[PDB]
Amino acid sequence: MIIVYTTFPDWESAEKVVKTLLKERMIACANLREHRAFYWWEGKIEEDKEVGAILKTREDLWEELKERIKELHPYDVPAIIRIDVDDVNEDYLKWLIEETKK
Amino acid sequence: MIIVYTTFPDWESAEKVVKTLLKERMIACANLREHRAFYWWEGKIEEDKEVGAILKTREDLWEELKERIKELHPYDVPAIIRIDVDDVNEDYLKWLIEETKK
Amino acid sequence: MIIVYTTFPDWESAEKVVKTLLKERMIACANLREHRAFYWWEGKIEEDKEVGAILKTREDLWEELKERIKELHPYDVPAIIRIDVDDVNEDYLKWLIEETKK
């Protein structure tokens, strides 16, 4: 399995994008939590409030999922970061395989 | 070293499981923080509040630690995700080797 | 690209260290968020409040960045953890390459 981390403008879209993704079964689970973003943006170091999301799904889905977020994200260019999981416990991953579209 | 991410029902058990783990010296450090879980559960997309935990220990401990959490987790099937650390600074990891059971 | 996770005593230094890093262009973006630390410290299992940071930059920068944090961190021995990103979307990483010193 893998972890996909992306950030959102506000809770609205995060929940919207995330529930859409679960419905479509692109991911099994999501963990959202706010955080303060400090980043280089066009003419200045900006600081705003964001809603980061931790999506968890199948490695084979990485491609189509990345595609799907591009299409759903409020941001013209989302951060879609994939971090592979080197190991996971025996039940969970069976629960995740079942929960994601085939 | 590696990172082990697991989620809890509430702060009660998170602290209970986490302090138990440190005592037993299964991990050197833990970082807990709440997050909103959106996941596929039996008959519906549920949404609740959770307490995610970031455990940090030795790679050789991964096996026994996974075992230990299964035995301690409130959840009948915990998410026990291992993410290997590709590199870490020189002091910290010595501090972590010392802090974990031999 | 890679992820560098480090923790801070309070928001003061986190923002100070993080903005310094962006200015110097050592990293493109940072996401800070508080968390409760439970860790083995000298004579006891301590529990305090921390400000964890997720720094995102180039893998080639890992070395100099680790060096730089050691020099900037309030902590005599920071946790500087590097987690490589196995994949990232096509725009973002171009935006990150541009945002980091050459």
From Swiss-Prot, chains A, B, C:
Binding residues annotated for Cu cation, in chain numbering: 48
SUPFAM superfamilies reported for this sequence: GlnB-like
Keywords: Copper, Cytoplasm, Metal-binding
Cofactor(s) in the UniProt record: Cu cation
Keyword Zinc: no
Swiss-Prot/TrEMBL GO biological process terms: response to metal ion
Disulfide links within the chain: none
Family to which the UniProt record says this protein belongs: Belongs to the CutA family.
Family matches, as PANTHER family: DIVALENT CATION TOLERANCE CUTA-RELATED (PTHR23419), FI09726P (PTHR23419:SF8)
Name this protein carries in UniProt: Divalent-cation tolerance protein CutA
Gene: cutA
